């Protein structure tokens, strides 16, 4: 249905067995995402 993928596609062993990838144009890694000044009279804290 197409001929090329200029996309944020991730390389992996399985997809290479069936299609040909190029040299990576950016490197990355899995990571984890989580939910995230003293007052004027702060000397009383």
């Amino acid at each position: 249905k197409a001929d090329i993928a200029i996309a944020p596609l991730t390389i992996t062993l399985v997809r290479e067995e069936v299609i040909d990838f190029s040299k990576p144009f950016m490197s990355l890694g899995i990571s984890i995402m989580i939910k995230k000044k003293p007052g004027v009279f702060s000397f009383l804290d």
């Binding site: 249905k1 197409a2 001929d3 090329i4 993928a5 200029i6 996309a7 944020p8």
Partner: peptide, 29 residues
Amino acid sequence: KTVVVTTILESPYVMMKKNHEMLEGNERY
């Protein structure tokens, strides 16, 4: 010669333009 290019809307890699309603073809991306 022309290439069939596949993509997905995963910002900031691919995202539609503001008011892309007036854009047609490759310009809407």
